Design a protein around this ligand. Structure first.
Ligand SMILES: C=CCn1nc(-c2ccc(O)cc2O)c2cccc(C(F)(F)F)c21
Ligand SMILES: C=CCn1nc(-c2ccc(O)cc2O)c2cccc(C(F)(F)F)c21
Ligand SMILES: C=CCn1nc(-c2ccc(O)cc2O)c2cccc(C(F)(F)F)c21
Ligand SMILES: C=CCn1nc(-c2ccc(O)cc2O)c2cccc(C(F)(F)F)c21
Lengths: 221, 233
């Protein structure tokens, strides 16, 4: 109940400090990417616990948010890394792959990376977007208790704080009020496409995923 | 359409609104799995024709090439149906108003296997809109955004980047949404917060759409050709 008292700058600083490291691929291709994703997942948990307001929530709810968001988070991280490598996805510094190397998903990832490039997405805006995804992707599916409804409001209030943060970053960058609301919209609409990609990828898997207990156990430590 | 005032944008959108259709009459009740699917499938099909008329009247849409218009529709058609359903169902807590003569609750959708999830998700969204007091002029803006956004990234060449115009119009709709919020007397802070809240919901509407498609291929979606033919008129 005090991430609600943070300012835009403190919010950013906290998020920038919580950033996971860029991990390397250990050296088929599914093995390297699965292993990479697995090691990344462990850092994602500690990153989450450092997102302002996340630990204010019950364990059950923390797990659910991650359960619904973990894939979208890996994906937006990938897209951010690959921003300055047109036509290539930088899974790891030692694992840069082009188109020809689930092509649908690969193409959508490139498309999103190009979009971030065009917009000149800033690192400070990136960490904000990643936070939004965490708090948003599972908020509409929590369920009758006063506590549950107590969580929802809290999450919504934190998301408001992040919106305030994003706007502030744009004002500081010298954007007009009109340019501010426009860029906010452009950024948030991209999240819909990231959601879409996560869903597509998720059905390819069905065609051992982080289950509910796998995460709940990992959060304990 | 980049010359319209926010007021003129709202008016044009409101005028484009499709009519509410009825589920075909005197179906055998209670329902069977295949009876339900038939009624809803038939409804969606008849609604698709009107959605296209609506799209043609969305400012900026006609400026695109036929091919691009079909692509946006192929991607967004289901999301557009769903946001319409959620809007209709707003003042019916715990129920979904697929049609004025077809008001179903949680347990009347248990007919189909797995579609209960989607039912719950649709109900949750409707509650959210209700809680936010989503206004009509905001709804039409959100729907237009879905149309122009859902397929904008999954379209190179010079002519192609000029079409990606779409982002200008989306900016225009954002301006309109904000203007609507300023009129109502919201503070700047409140304005950007509400704008964010609305757009984040689109992410969830996308999700519900994807779950739908998932079960569709799990049990004859509007084809490219079909959508093109109906566009030509
Ligand atoms: C282009 C998506 C493939 N991909 N990406 C990833 C992936 C891994 C880590 C990461 O940070 C981002 C990713 O997209 C991945 C992980 C396991 C398996 C797969 C594959 F689809 F190939 F089976 C993974
Ligand atoms: C479900 C999609 C494939 N996949 N699997 C995984 C995956 C990674 C680790 C793990 O322990 C289990 C997984 O299914 C994955 C991770 C990131 C990105 C992707 C994707 F391919 F979708 F882009 C991943
Ligand atoms: C959530 C109910 C399922 N549903 N909804 C719809 C649907 C139809 C029209 C509309 O405006 C909104 C809808 O959710 C639908 C259409 C065809 C088939 C189905 C079914 F799942 F049963 F197979 C449909
Ligand atoms: C039955 C699969 C899902 N579906 N299919 C359809 C659908 C509608 C018309 C048509 O010609 C074919 C369809 O699969 C549909 C329409 C509205 C809502 C839904 C959904 F269930 F996802 F909510 C629809």
């Amino acid at each position: 109940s005090l991430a609600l008292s943070l300012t835009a700058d403190q919010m950013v600083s906290a998020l920038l400090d919580a950033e996971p490291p860029i991990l390397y691929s250990e050296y088929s291709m599914m093995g390297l990417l699965t292993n990479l994703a697995d090691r990344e997942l462990v850092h994602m948990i500690n990153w989450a616990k450092r997102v302002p307001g996340f630990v204010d929530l019950t364990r059950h709810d923390q797990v659910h948010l991650l359960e619904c968001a973990w894939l979208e988070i890996l994906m937006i991280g990938l897209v951010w890394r690959s921003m300055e490598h047109p036509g290539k996805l930088l899974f790891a510094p030692n694992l840069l792959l082009d188109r020809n190397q689930m092509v649908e998903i690969f193409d959508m990832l490139l498309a999103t990376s190009s979009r971030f490039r065009m917009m000149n997405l800033q690192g400070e805006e990136f960490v904000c977007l990643k936070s939004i995804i965490l708090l948003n992707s599972g908020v509409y599916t929590f369920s009758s208790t006063l506590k549950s409804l107590e969580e929802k409001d809290h999450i919504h209030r934190v998301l408001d704080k992040i919106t305030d943060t994003l706007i502030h970053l744009m004002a500081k960058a010298g954007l007009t009020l009109q340019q501010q609301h426009q860029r906010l919209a452009q950024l948030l609409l991209i999240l819909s496409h990231i959601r879409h990609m996560s869903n597509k990828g998720m059905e390819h898997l069905y065609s051992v995923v982080p289950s509910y207990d796998l995460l709940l156990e990992m959060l304990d430590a």
